[PDB]
Amino acid sequence: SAADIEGAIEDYVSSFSADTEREEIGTVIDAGDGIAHVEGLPSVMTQELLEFPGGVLGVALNLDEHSVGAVILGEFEKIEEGQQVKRTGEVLSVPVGDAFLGRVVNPLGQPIDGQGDIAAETRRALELQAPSVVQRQSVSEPLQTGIKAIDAMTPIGRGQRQLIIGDRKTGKTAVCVDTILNQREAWLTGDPKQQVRCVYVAIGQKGTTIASVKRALEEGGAMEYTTIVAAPASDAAGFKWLAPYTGSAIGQHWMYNGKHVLIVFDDLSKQADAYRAISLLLRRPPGREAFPGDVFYLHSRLLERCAKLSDELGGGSMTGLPIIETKANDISAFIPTNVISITDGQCFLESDLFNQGVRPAINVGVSVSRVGGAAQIKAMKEVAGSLRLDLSQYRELEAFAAFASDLDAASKAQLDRGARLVELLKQPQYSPLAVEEQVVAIFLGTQGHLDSVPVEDVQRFESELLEHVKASHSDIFDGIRETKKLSEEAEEKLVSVINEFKKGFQASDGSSVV
Amino acid sequence: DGQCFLESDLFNQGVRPAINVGVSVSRVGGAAQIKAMKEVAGSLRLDLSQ
Amino acid sequence: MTQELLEFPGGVLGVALNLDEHSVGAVILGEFEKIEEGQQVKRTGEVLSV
Amino acid sequence: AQGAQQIQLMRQQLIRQLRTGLGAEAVNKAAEIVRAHVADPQAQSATVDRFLSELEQMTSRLRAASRQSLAALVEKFDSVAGGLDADGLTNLADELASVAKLLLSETALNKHLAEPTDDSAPKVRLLERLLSDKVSATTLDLLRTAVSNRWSTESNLIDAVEHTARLALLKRAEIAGEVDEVEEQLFRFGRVLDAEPRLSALLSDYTTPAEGRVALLDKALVNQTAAALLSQTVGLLRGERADEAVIDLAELAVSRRGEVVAHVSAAAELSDAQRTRLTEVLSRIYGRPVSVQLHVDPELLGGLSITVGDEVIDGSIASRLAAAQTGLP
Amino acid sequence: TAGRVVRITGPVVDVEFPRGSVPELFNALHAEITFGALAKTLTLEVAQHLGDSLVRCISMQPTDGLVRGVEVTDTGASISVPVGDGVKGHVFNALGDCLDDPGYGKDFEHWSIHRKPPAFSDLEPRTEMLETGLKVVDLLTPYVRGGKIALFGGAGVGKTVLIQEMINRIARNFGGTSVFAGVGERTREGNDLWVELADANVLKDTALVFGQMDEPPGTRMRVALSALTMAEFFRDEQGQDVLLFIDNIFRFTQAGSEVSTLLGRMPSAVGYQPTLADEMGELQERITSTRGRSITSMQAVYVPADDYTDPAPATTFAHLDATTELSRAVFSKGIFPAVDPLASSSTILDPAIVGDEHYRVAQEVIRILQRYKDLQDIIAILGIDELSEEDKQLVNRARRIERFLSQNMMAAEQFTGQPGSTVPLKETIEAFDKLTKGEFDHLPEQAFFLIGGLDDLAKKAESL
Amino acid sequence: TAGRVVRITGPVVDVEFPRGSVPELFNALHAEITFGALAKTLTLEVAQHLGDSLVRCISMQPTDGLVRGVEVTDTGASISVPVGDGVKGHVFNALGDCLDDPGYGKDFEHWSIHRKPPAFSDLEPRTEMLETGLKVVDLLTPYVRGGKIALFGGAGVGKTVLIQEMINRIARNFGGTSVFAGVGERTREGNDLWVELADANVLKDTALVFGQMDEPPGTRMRVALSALTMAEFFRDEQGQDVLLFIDNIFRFTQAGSEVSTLLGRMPSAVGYQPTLADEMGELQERITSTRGRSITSMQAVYVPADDYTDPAPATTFAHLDATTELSRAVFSKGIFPAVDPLASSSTILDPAIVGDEHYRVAQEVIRILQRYKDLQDIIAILGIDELSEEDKQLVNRARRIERFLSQNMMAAEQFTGQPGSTVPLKETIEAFDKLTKGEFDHLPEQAFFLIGGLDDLAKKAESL
Amino acid sequence: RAQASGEVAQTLTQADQQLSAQGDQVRSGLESSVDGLSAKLASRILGVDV
Numbered sequence A: 001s002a003a004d005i006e007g008a009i010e011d012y013v014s015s016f017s018a019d020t021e022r023e024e025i026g027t028v029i030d031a032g033d034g035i036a037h038v039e040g041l042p043s044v045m046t047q048e049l050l051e052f053p054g055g056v057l058g059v060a061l062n063l064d065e066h067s068v069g070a071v072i073l074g075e076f077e078k079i080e081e082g083q084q085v086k087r088t089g090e091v092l093s094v095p096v097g098d099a100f101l102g103r104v105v106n107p108l109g110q111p112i113d114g115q116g117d118i119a120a121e122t123r124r125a126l127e128l129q130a131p132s133v134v135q136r137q138s139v140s141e142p143l144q145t146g147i148k149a150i151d152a153m154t155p156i157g158r159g160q161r162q163l164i165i166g167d168r169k170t171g172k173t174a175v176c177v178d179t180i181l182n183q184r185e186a187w188l189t190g191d192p193k194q195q196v197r198c199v200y201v202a203i204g205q206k207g208t209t210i211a212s213v214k215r216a217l218e219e220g221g222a223m224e225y226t227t228i229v230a231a232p233a234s235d236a237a238g239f240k241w242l243a244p245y246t247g248s249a250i251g252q253h254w255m256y257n258g259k260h261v262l263i264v265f266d267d268l269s270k271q272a273d274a275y276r277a278i279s280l281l282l283r284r285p286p287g288r289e290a291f292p293g294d295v296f297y298l299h300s301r302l303l304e305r306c307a308k309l310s311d312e313l314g315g316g317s318m319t320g321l322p323i324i325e326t327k328a329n330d331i332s333a334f335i336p337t338n339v340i341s342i343t344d345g346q347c348f349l350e351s352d353l354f355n356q357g358v359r360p361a362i363n364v365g366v367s368v369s370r371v372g373g374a375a376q377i378k379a380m381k382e383v384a385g386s387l388r389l390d391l392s393q394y395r396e397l398e399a400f401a402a403f404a405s406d407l408d409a410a411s412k413a414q415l416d417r418g419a420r421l422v423e424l425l426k427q428p429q430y431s432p433l434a435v436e437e438q439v440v441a442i443f444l445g446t447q448g449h450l451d452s453v454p455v456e457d458v459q460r461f462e463s464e465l466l467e468h469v470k471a472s473h474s475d476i477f478d479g480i481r482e483t484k485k486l487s488e489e490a491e492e493k494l495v496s497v498i499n500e501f502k503k504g505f506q507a508s509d510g511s512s513v514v
Numbered sequence B: 001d002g003q004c005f006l007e008s009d010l011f012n013q014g015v016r017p018a019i020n021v022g023v024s025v026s027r028v029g030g031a032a033q034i035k036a037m038k039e040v041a042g043s044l045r046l047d048l049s050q
Numbered sequence C: 001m002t003q004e005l006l007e008f009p010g011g012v013l014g015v016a017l018n019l020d021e022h023s024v025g026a027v028i029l030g031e032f033e034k035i036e037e038g039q040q041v042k043r044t045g046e047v048l049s050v
Numbered sequence D: 001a002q003g004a005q006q007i008q009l010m011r012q013q014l015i016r017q018l019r020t021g022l023g024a025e026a027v028n029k030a031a032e033i034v035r036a037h038v039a040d041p042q043a044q045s046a047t048v049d050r051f052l053s054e055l056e057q058m059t060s061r062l063r064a065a066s067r068q069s070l071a072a073l074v075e076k077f078d079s080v081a082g083g084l085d086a087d088g089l090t091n092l093a094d095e096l097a098s099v100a101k102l103l104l105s106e107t108a109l110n111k112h113l114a115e116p117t118d119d120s121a122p123k124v125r126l127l128e129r130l131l132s133d134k135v136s137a138t139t140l141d142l143l144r145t146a147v148s149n150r151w152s153t154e155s156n157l158i159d160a161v162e163h164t165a166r167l168a169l170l171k172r173a174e175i176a177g178e179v180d181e182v183e184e185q186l187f188r189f190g191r192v193l194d195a196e197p198r199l200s201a202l203l204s205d206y207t208t209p210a211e212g213r214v215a216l217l218d219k220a221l222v223n224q225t226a227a228a229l230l231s232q233t234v235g236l237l238r239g240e241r242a243d244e245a246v247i248d249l250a251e252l253a254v255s256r257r258g259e260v261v262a263h264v265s266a267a268a269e270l271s272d273a274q275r276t277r278l279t280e281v282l283s284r285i286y287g288r289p290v291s292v293q294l295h296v297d298p299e300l301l302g303g304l305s306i307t308v309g310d311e312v313i314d315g316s317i318a319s320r321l322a323a324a325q326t327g328l329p
Numbered sequence E, F: 001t002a003g004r005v006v007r008i009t010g011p012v013v014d015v016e017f018p019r020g021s022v023p024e025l026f027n028a029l030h031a032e033i034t035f036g037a038l039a040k041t042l043t044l045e046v047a048q049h050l051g052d053s054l055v056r057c058i059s060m061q062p063t064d065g066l067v068r069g070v071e072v073t074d075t076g077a078s079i080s081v082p083v084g085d086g087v088k089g090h091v092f093n094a095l096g097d098c099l100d101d102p103g104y105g106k107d108f109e110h111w112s113i114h115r116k117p118p119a120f121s122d123l124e125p126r127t128e129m130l131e132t133g134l135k136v137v138d139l140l141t142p143y144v145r146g147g148k149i150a151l152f153g154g155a156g157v158g159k160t161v162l163i164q165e166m167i168n169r170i171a172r173n174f175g176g177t178s179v180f181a182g183v184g185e186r187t188r189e190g191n192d193l194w195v196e197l198a199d200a201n202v203l204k205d206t207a208l209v210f211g212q213m214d215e216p217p218g219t220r221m222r223v224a225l226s227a228l229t230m231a232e233f234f235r236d237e238q239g240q241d242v243l244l245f246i247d248n249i250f251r252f253t254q255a256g257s258e259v260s261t262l263l264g265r266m267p268s269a270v271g272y273q274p275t276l277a278d279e280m281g282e283l284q285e286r287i288t289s290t291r292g293r294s295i296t297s298m299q300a301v302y303v304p305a306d307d308y309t310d311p312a313p314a315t316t317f318a319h320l321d322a323t324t325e326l327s328r329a330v331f332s333k334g335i336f337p338a339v340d341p342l343a344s345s346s347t348i349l350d351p352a353i354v355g356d357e358h359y360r361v362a363q364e365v366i367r368i369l370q371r372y373k374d375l376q377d378i379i380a381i382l383g384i385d386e387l388s389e390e391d392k393q394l395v396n397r398a399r400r401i402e403r404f405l406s407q408n409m410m411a412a413e414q415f416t417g418q419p420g421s422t423v424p425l426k427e428t429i430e431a432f433d434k435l436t437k438g439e440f441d442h443l444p445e446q447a448f449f450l451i452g453g454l455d456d457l458a459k460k461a462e463s464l
Numbered sequence G: 001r002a003q004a005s006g007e008v009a010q011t012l013t014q015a016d017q018q019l020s021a022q023g024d025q026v027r028s029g030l031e032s033s034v035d036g037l038s039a040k041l042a043s044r045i046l047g048v049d050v
């Protein structure tokens, strides 16, 4: 250990050299609440990283006739009037590379997990332009979330932008963490075409919450391929403002190299809440809900960097899963209204469904994916196309639950079916299903094998069936996986094994089945 | 330290002084009463709110 | 005069609302697109009238 | 496996903070070694020579309208000065300062006088009535242009009159052949009043009566040009810091000559050869004649530092120590 | 001679100019961004004169990397789009620069997007009806030649297919042209549209202008005027009838409000710009018929909070003359083009403009479909047998009516292979008059799906 | 050398300093007031640098009597308060001066109020449950030992009695050290707490810092940090486990909102400072617990206008692991402690931690009460007999669950006369498991109201 | 899981002891290395031989 300890310092000494190069200077005139006004710096450029002598950084977000308004990224206390401010020749830029996999980094690509320094592969500006209409491709291949309620009713294709919009403590973080955990079965196969990479941008989380998510990912092995960009609430407004662009840069580097990426913004509401602070402090003119005018351009220029690239650009993709925290379920507020119009789809989580026992609590019928069936494998299209119709018929008939005996038989059957499909879409956290398994799960429902199982047992029946089929009849899952289609022969054998199992299954009332 | 919320809809329907027993409260409570009233009225507000 | 009708070189008319100590804030009638800095503005001598 | 990676990363953190503390001790011992080396005058001479040779190898506040009007007013002052004389310039500066005081006090007059118009003739007449008997006619001829032109704010008219009086006094200094002495004394007083924050802050008396500040200057602080300039400036200071005002006086003096002032920092005063070499090198770098205001200080031991305009070229034991100390792993 | 940037606050940029060179407002100015990673020729649109030779401008592209004092050159004219027959088949940004082939179109004649609407004396004094030939459109919601049609679409309800259909309609029946103003377009669905229209081979008859969400609100605002200026060239000079699609107009209002806030103007009511109605009119009052040729428009219109009283949708609905609404509840039946006959409406369906027979037939169709839309509750909860003989005698006609509103249309020609039918107006009226009176009860429902008129109804029924 | 006051406006003061002597941000400045009974040394905290060597400061003490031009001396350091074992058993103000015994703390080690929160490397997620003995808390919103607990609630809904009861339950048996921050809290309840802790002798292990609402915004802001720095000393420098109570944390932000407009910050939404989230995070992140040394935070959060959408509560929600959530609706029904069981939440309530036996019952209770709130609108107008037999049975169970969640708290003796009760966790789970499955539908609805457990439930049912 | 957790805790304690001993031993030599590193850095910081 001593040898390398001494050798590193020896090489550092050897590589040291003069900083004689002339540079421009400014001086702080005002400082307060995270903003510093710097006079001078005539050649400064917008978004340029300024450096203050205590080792502090600024963004130079506002230029006036005689002053530069710089948001301070950290340790604001150390700034004072009269401090010599130097300008770097560089716009906001962050390192990128595969070394970030498994690391927690601040919005400047510096490690905050307390592990070693990250081996930077390249550096990218935080504000490069998005892939244009001509560079992109149709979103034709799925981003399996492992959530039955999503992959079957509001599917996500890699290259899509799907909003997890909901109240607090309604399962948003849970859903996106399950999305990240599900990708391991793809990662373990070293095929970059299957292999998804992930970036969990934590904006305004408390440190222990980011640590809980990190522990939930480690418990699932996701840290082999997941990065966290952490702007904890402890850190300045600027860090909360730049965390999503740092994550987007880390993901864009992988995307343009031809990898597939999954970006979770948690939460963009606090991204907007931080840009509002920065803007109001800079005395920019306010608008609705006190946000600045460009608060849409804030999020669009972020989410629109998610794309699926053409074959000419390696075919990569970056899949955005932005989360937003609505207040009293007002999806009509400003920032929700913006992101609902920027994103391709919306997985509306609602607290009532959450308390009614419907978890992951996606309010189907209101949730949508404008991409549609293109984000599904043929087997899932075939099996789940009827699911939305059946659940809408149930959403109508549910008012007649009190009168199930008077209801007409043809729709009595639909009510009994809908209740079991609802139970079928229930799913516990951190237990994402592979597509091969949830194809069969939805097949149990839409093809009517659950119709004789008592409602209260559905969740267990499925959980037992998939455990039997997974262990004893793997050829079914192998077929669905390797051919992406539920062939007729595998359907018939699946029905045969479903009835094989259903004779042994026992329900709460001890009754038999079929 | 407490509220005597006089509802107009109680005042009109004959309940005068019109204290809305449910929202009204005195957080010092029994310490602001003589022992006799603490005996006889120890839980009157909760009984009337229920 | 206040509420005087001022003519701007593009044939445009405006109403002199806010007579400041040294300036005259006017509401432009018609194509304000044709109005710009440095343009000579002159009096019609007529209060806002048709 | 989590435990295995955990122990490996604990080892890595151990060696990392080992390297960090070792580098810190190394840079601190190097700091002590170089701070001992810097004691010799020959070593300082070598450092300044190395930096100078390396370098050898290598109105604004005002807006557009006021900017143009001030340029034109100076263009007419050029014509006035072409016929002026020292004795006349002495009175010109004082009368311009007097009218500056008038406009600074009778604000109601000033707001009308600064009115932006092309047909400024009435304003001129307002001046002609008010001043024609109070001050000499040449001052009126120049204030005619000062008033006729356009100003972005009522403050810039006073600013332009003060600037014109300052230019007239500086022109008296230049014709008398004191161009160098006046600049030297202006920088002397600049550094003095920047180092004496009690009397200098007391000089920014625009809340107090000005004649007190004038008499304070006369008592405390010399070529009559610099004294007149300082007294005029403190009389027309208008809330600006006295030190930053006198340094702006010196900047304007050297820029009127055509040069620009480059502030220099070093451990000790170098010989004339170093001064001339540095001036020629800076002129080569920035393409202008230059003057060096050497603000020597021991804290910035070693090397040589220069700042001109809003740019720096800095070499010193302290700055390079900061560079070495911040690079540790 | 040229100006200098002196202040930058996001998309807003202040440019100082010499005394005599100040540009008139709504002029386009060019500026440099030289930092390599972000190098650009930044475009600025003059919004205000701040006084003292200083102009407040709103940037068309991200200002990141701008420098104070950088040179700004006045072009002497507003944002100007290339116009001609050459813009058909290509996709443009709001500034008139081609995406598919950079530098294309720069040789064409350029028209300033800021131009006044037709003079009062040039307008048409009466509302002519657009014989597009779609049964449901022609009967229930007759479009207006020179009017505007709200298009309440959705996910997977055939909006893009109806767009392709109307493009083919105008391009083949009227010999016209189409311009697609994508205001605030999602880049993904914009590329989807590009490749779908290229596959349908209708792109050759369409000019697309995409103000992408990537961009500051300046271009998301001005792109509607860009496309409308291409349409105004096709109307005024080449004498064609045009169909201007706008998706989405509410995002034009939104971008206008964002620009208003950026420039520092006090917000109005709910938070829109004070000039809301003035610029919405500047856009809408310009889509009209002149000298026998017209620009019709289909405007996809968001409605925030589903509140039809919010200033933005209220101001939008003050102009547009018809409302087509697509429903999943109808698409899922196989009833293409899926226009909901009951939610949809038109201001021309009055016996003064359309003939009295047309009005009567449409009102009877609406009555029957209203009865059926009320009875579907019984149909689902109690079954058809719960209905009386007269209610079943009605439902039997209603099913076939709603089927007959479907049409084999030129957009389906891409997939079914069968050619798209154009149904004359008189034949549509004389078909639904007989169908409502029950003259075709004996035919099965399958006979009415996706059939182009009454003679085609017979051709299908007699062979089935 | 020293400075001088230039401008005074409310509690905010502006102070000019020589060029090089300007104090750093958050330094403590001292200035004398020399009038009569108001004569005092005045502490100001440097909030901003305004340029021209001016600095804007917030007065920790009322500015009445302050004079322009008076001398101001910088401490050279921030506000510092005593830390050590000796501060236990004593009462302090935000400035660190003892209210009980003036001059007591002036020989202690003094720690700056301001310090950075621990690094993300020092943080681990806590999962140990804290048993309080309150049915609603232990079942539906269980607390975390070492976590950040909170008691949200509008005005008057009982936050103070609940927080004092949690003190009586935790700090009594807790073996470590306790700190109580009174932030903008009533002085009367602070004295009731002081004398109650003195009577229970818990005071020997409790350090109290009071910045009551009679105090100006500066001290209402910095009192939370002054208590938190004592908590952080007990955490970091001694390792002895800590409890940190805070009533009311909202006031910390509120005080800032009072000074923001004087500090020249433009106001945001409904009227908070723009720094809201930054200040609240800089405070809350410090309250966290590093590995191997715990702080069990218990902070009551005021909810303006009962609107849980107000930016302050909405931002506070993020920093908490368990959120008991009081509401005026539950309070009006006499269901004191008035916890809304559906709003309240906890991160620990997972079967992996609390056990399936607990999770099942909690989720069943939440499901029943959610269905009850969904059905109340029907019940109020249509009636109970109009429901299904199953919905009606669920309603009769929900009405009883509501009232069994109520509990006779010890601190609520003065509210109820009767003594308080502690219900073990096992008995809570058993009781609510019986309730949800109907094993008590035969008891009168009133028997569950304000009763501590199953034995007391039986005794009260047999008393009716 | 509990058995492996015990193994991990044992690994952590072994790390603590091993790294304490290694830190002392390596700092013993680092004290010497520091003199030469500082001597060379004195030349690099000065930009000339010292």
Ligand SMILES: Nc1ncnc2c1ncn2[C@@H]1O[C@H](COP(=O)(O)OP(=O)(O)OP(=O)(O)O)[C@@H](O)[C@H]1O
Pocket: A167, A168, A169, A170, A171, A172, A173, A174, A175, A325, A359, A360, A427, A428, A429, F317, F318, F346, F347, F348, F349, F350
């Ligand atoms: N699919 C699920 N099944 C069962 N429980 C769930 C599920 N999803 C979430 N939960 C429960 O909800 C809580 C977590 O909610 P979550 O953290 O997703 O909310 P959130 O959107 O992150 O809110 P915030 O971001 O404000 O913390 C936990 O108690 C967890 O057990």
Ligand SMILES: [Mg+2]
Pocket: A172, A173, A266
């Ligand atoms: Mg979350």
